DNA sequence: GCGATCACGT
DNA sequence: ACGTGATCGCA
């Protein structure tokens, strides 16, 4: 029983309400709002969008911070309303973020999955209403209106039990002071978008398509035959059958053609180096040139990513359409793709600030390892210092290969450390990789104590927590399968580190957003990628940002070691180095 | 649509 | 390890 309203009435504008602003298109940027539902003390309402959104009283209510709304995934609605020039304020409860904080492993992606966490099943999953894939379609108004009102009624009913459990978990402030404020900041970042120099991308695409046409022909000559180089199946026939190259590794369904395997194969035939060259070129051309060009809005030449705030098990943000968190940086030929990301206005510049080794600094603090804390208090090169201890040599005796192996141990130490992964990344034996680990724990006994203690805490409590009380349940920590249990143990060690770094970055974003407004700067956040914050700002604001941004980031939280921030700026994302 | 494979950045 | 994405090849 609900009201299919033809007009906005005063009772729909109570100062507390569950609100549903339904955007069915997966990418909500400039997307239709197919319907609105309001549940409050006075009843349940369905409002047609081309009525409420043209009603001054409803729009005023949407934008009044004092009128509190409970929603699911408020950022989706916030952004769709931004594209209509409408401001959404007063969202005091986001059931999506609440369910994500209560248990990220649930993969709660719609109201029904979250309600099922609390034995509430009077709401259908979105996929049952809209179908999936080709069959996906908005249903007739009666069916649509019933779904939206059931979702709003579930949100209405679910706020208290979710807030109660968040409070029992000591996560009430995590939701209200971190994730929900961050949702608004992310909505502004997505809406602003990042300007793309498409002519430069097009220029790069033409060039890659040229080098590809060359390497391709060369491969057809070394193979004495034509074939689809991009088919791992076909390529395996040319390599491990026609050319008789050794089979060093075998995927689950045949021969592996990983760059890992091919590297070891290069000595046997000149084709291998070209196939490797062809694959990097092909990866750039198809994923980063053509892929980026597909998602650039032709009206504004901006990409408007979507930050997924309730996806990872660590609390890190994820990004889609495009995923800007893997634009090439390692290789120079692929690093130049960042030259296409420019300021959205003339005489503006890109400013980029990144935490320096925040994960290892977080580890130092959490493990209270004297050796690790002292290394950062002296602002040492951590990889070089790690090599000095592991190999018991002075700084002058550290060779480039020793530092490379110390760096791999550090990369592993923060991601669990397994032996097979270290041995794999270092192309060494497990016993040798095991020897590296034990030398490391000899040098960093507090890290070893932390790794043992956090595993035991994961087993006793059933979860691990981050600095700001994000938790991750680890049910497989007791499993009797060595592999399933090993992964759970490594997530026990890694999650407090990665998740705490994620907490710090999110808090810095909130602190930076407040400071920029305090200082009345025009600078604005565009992207959070990994441990970096990217802003654009007028060139006249660069000197102030050079002091402001690192200070806010370095003060986001107080650890037992300093937080270091490297920052650069330039006319492009590339040049902000 | 869907599994398998590959690869990119943390 | 976190993921996003693209290509291919079979239903
Ligand atoms: N554990 C982690 N988890 C997620 N992202 C990480 C990370 N560690 C680094 N990133 C990012 C953060 C860093 O800003 C970025 C680059 O640092 P690196 O090359 O990975 N290792 P470093 O800088 O300490 O030693 P060198 O002097 O040889 O460069 O990788
Ligand atoms: Mg670093």
CATH of the domain at A92: 3.30.420.10
Whether residue A211 is found in the same domain as residue A352? no
Instruction: Determine whether the annotation assigns residue A260 to a binding site.
Output: no
d(CA A186, CA A180): 10
CA-based nearest residue to A280, from A220, A208, A201: A208
- Does A414 sit in the ligand 1 pocket, CB within 6 Å? yes
How many angstroms separate the alpha carbon of residue A265 from the centre of ligand 2? 32
Strand C–CB A490 distance below 7 A: yes
Residues preceding chain discontinuities in chain A with C to N over 2.5 Å? 417
CA-based nearest residue to A359, from A455, A488, A433, A466: A466
A57-64 CB contacts, 8 Å cutoff, 24+ apart:
A57/A8, A57/A10, A57/A13, A58/A8, A58/A12, A58/A13, A59/A86, A61/A12, A61/A13, A62/A86, A62/A87, A62/A88, A62/A89, A63/A87, A63/A88, A63/A89, A64/A89, A64/A90
How many angstroms separate the alpha carbon of residue A243 from the centre of ligand 2? 43
Whether residue A281 is found in the same domain as residue A388? no
CA-based nearest residue to A6, from A39, A57, A49: A49
- Per DSSP (E only), the strands in A214-277 are 250-251, 254-255
A134: the nucleotide nearest its CA (via C1') is B1
Pairing between β-strand A348-356 and β-strand A43-47 as defined by DSSP bridges: unpaired
- Does A385 sit in the ligand 1 pocket, CB within 6 Å? no
Whether residue A11 is found in the same domain as residue A128? yes
Strand C–CB A265 distance below 7 A: no
Q: Given the CA of residue A411, which atom of ligand 1 is nearest to it? A: 1
CA of A226 to C1' of B5 (A): 21
A421-426 CB contacts, 8 Å cutoff, 24+ apart:
none
Q: Which token pair is A173?
A: 């402030």
CA of A180 to C1' of B7 (A): 34
The number of residues in chain A equals 577
Which strand C bases fall within 7 angstroms of a protein CB?
1-9
Q: Which token pair is A105?
A: 């492993």
Strand B–CB A334 distance below 7 A: yes
Whether residue A343 is found in the same domain as residue A379? no
Beta bridge partners, A46, equal A4, A37
Q: Which helix (H) or strand (E) holds A286?
A: none
d(CA A257, CA A244): 14
Please provide the distance, in angstroms rounded to a whole number, between the alpha carbons at the two ends of chain A: 59
Q: Which residues of A329-358 are buried (b: 16+ CB within 10 A; e: fewer)?
A: eeeeebeebbbbbbbbeeebbbbbbbbebb
Residue A226 has a CB neighbour count (10 Å cut-off) of 10
CA of A132 to C1' of B2 (A): 14
| A255 φ/ψ angles, rounded to the nearest 5 degrees | -85, 135
CA of A411 to C1' of B4 (A): 28
Which parts of A103-173 fold into alpha helices (H)? 111-116, 126-130, 141-168, 172-173
CA of A374 to C1' of C2 (A): 29
CB A395 within 8 A of CB A388: yes
Q: Which residues of A393-410 are buried (b: 16+ CB within 10 A; e: fewer)?
A: eeeeebeeebbebbbbbb
Whether residue A466 is found in the same domain as residue A408? yes
Identify the residue whose Cα has the smallest distance to the C1' of C2. A312
Domain with A170, as residue range(s), is: 1-191
d(CA A535, CA A537): 7
Side by side, which strands form the sheet with A194-196?
A296-297, A302-303, A194-196, A341-342
CB A72 within 8 A of CB A187: no
- Does A564 sit in the ligand 1 pocket, CB within 6 Å? no
Q: Please state the domain count of chain A.
A: 4
Whether residue A80 is found in the same domain as residue A182? yes
Domain end call among A191, A222, A247: A191
DSSP string over A351-402? EEEEEESHHHHHHHHHHT-HHHHHHHHTT--HHHHHHHHHHT--GGG--HHH
Domain end call among A191, A225, A250: A191
Pocket test for ligand 1, best of A531, A561, A565 (most atoms within 8 A of CB): A531
Helix (H, G, I), strand (E, B) or coil at A475: helix
Whether residue A467 is found in the same domain as residue A329? no
- Does A357 sit in the ligand 1 pocket, CB within 6 Å? yes
Ligand whose nearest atom lies closest to the CA of A505:
1
Whether residue A242 is found in the same domain as residue A252? yes
Q: What is the dihedral of CA A481, A485, A487, A489, to 10 degrees?
A: -170
Whether residue A461 is found in the same domain as residue A522? no
d(CA A575, CA A577): 5
CATH of the domain at A541: 3.30.70.370
Q: Which token pair is A126?
A: 């979105």
Pocket test for ligand 1, best of A357, A359, A381, A508 (most atoms within 8 A of CB): A357
Whether residue A219 is found in the same domain as residue A270? yes
The experimental method behind these coordinates is: X-ray
Whether residue A407 is found in the same domain as residue A529? no
- Does A383 sit in the ligand 1 pocket, CB within 6 Å? yes
Strand C–CB A470 distance below 7 A: no
Domain end call among A478, A501, A524: A501
Phi-psi region of A464 (alpha: psi -120 to 50; beta: other; left: phi over 0): beta
CA-based nearest residue to A72, from A40, A100, A95, A55: A95
Pairing between β-strand A43-47 and β-strand A3-5 as defined by DSSP bridges: parallel
CA triplet A434, A315, A181: central angle to 5 degrees?
A: 155
CATH of the domain at A253: 1.20.1060.10
Q: Given the CA of residue A381, which atom of ligand 1 is nearest to it? A: 27
Pocket test for ligand 1, best of A335, A401, A530, A568 (most atoms within 8 A of CB): A530
Beta bridge partners, A250, equal A255
CB A196 within 8 A of CB A296: yes
Say how far residue A276 (Cα) sits from the centre of its chain: 28
Whether residue A25 is found in the same domain as residue A132? yes
d(CA A66, CA A237): 67
A286: the nucleotide nearest its CA (via C1') is C6
Resolution of the entry in angstroms: 2.0
Identify the residue whose Cα has the smallest distance to the C1' of B3. A253
How many angstroms separate the alpha carbon of residue A440 from the centre of ligand 1? 18
CA distances from A553 to A274, A513, A550, A574 (A): 44, 11, 5, 21
């Amino acid at each position: 029983a609900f009201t299919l309203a033809d007009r906005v009435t005063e009772e729909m504008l109570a100062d507390k309400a569950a609100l549903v602003v339904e955007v069915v298109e997966e990418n909500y940027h400039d997307a239709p709002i197919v319907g609105i539902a309001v549940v409050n003390e006075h009843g349940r309402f369905f409002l047609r969008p081309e009525t409420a959104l043209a009603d001054p009283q409803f729009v005023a209510w949407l934008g009044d911070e004092t009128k509190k709304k409970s929603m699911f995934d408020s950022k989706r609605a916030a952004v769709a309303l931004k594209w209509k020039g409408i401001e959404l304020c007063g969202v005091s409860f986001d059931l999506l973020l609440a369910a994500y904080l209560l248990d990220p492993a649930q993969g709660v992606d719609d109201v029904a999955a979250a309600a099922k966490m609390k034995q509430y099943e009077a709401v259908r999953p979105d996929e049952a209403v809209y179908g999936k894939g080709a069959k996906r379609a908005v249903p007739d108004e009666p069916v649509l209106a019933e779904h939206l009102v059931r979702k709003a009624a579930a949100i209405w009913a679910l706020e208290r039990p979710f807030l109660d459990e968040l409070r029992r978990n000591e996560q009430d402030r995590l939701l209200v002071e971190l994730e929900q404020p961050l949702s608004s900041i992310l909505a502004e970042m997505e809406f602003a978008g990042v300007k793309v120099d498409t002519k430069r991308l097009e220029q790069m695409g033409e060039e890659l398509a040229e080098q590809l046409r060359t390497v391709e022909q060369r491969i057809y000559e070394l193979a004495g035959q034509e074939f689809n180089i991009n088919s791992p199946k076909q390529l395996g026939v040319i390599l491990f059958e026609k050319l008789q190259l050794p089979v060093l590794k075998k995927t689950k369904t045949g021969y592996s053609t990983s760059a890992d395997v091919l590297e070891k194969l290069a000595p046997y035939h000149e084709i291998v180096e070209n196939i490797l060259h062809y694959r990097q070129l092909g990866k750039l051309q198809s994923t980063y040139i053509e892929g980026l060009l597909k998602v650039v809005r032709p009206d504004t030449k901006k990409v408007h990513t979507i930050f997924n705030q309730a996806l990872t098990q660590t609390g890190r943000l994820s990004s889609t359409e495009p995923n800007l968190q893997n634009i090439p940086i390692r290789l120079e030929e692929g690093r130049k793709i960042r030259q296409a990301f420019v300021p959205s206005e003339s005489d503006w510049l890109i400013f980029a600030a990144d935490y320096s080794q925040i994960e290892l600094r977080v580890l130092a603090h959490i493990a209270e390892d004297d050796n690790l804390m002292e290394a950062f208090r002296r602002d040492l090169d951590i990889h070089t210092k790690t090599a000095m201890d592991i190999f018991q040599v002075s700084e002058d005796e550290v060779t480039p290969n020793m530092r490379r192996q110390a760096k791999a141990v550090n990369f592993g130490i923060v991601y669990g450390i397994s032996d097979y992964g270290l041995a794999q990344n270092l192309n060494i034996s497990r016993k040798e990789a095991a020897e590296f680990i034990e030398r490391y724990f000899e040098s960093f006994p507090g890290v070893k104590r932390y790794m043992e203690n956090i595993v035991q805490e994961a087993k006793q409590k059933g979860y691990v927590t981050t600095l700001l009380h994000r938790r991750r349940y680890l049910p497989d920590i007791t499993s009797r399968n060595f592999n399933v249990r090993s992964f759970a143990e490594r997530m026990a060690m890694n999650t407090p580190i990665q998740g705490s770094a994620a907490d710090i970055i999110k808090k810095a974003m909130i602190d930076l957003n407040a400071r920029l407004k305090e200082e009345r700067l025009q600078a604005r956040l565009l992207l959070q990628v990994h441990d970096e914050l990217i802003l654009e700002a007028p060139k006249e604001e660069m000197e102030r940002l050079c002091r402001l941004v690192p200070e806010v980031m370095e003060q986001a939280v107080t650890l037992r070691v300093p937080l270091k921030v490297d920052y650069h700026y330039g006319s492009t994302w590339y040049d902000a180095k």
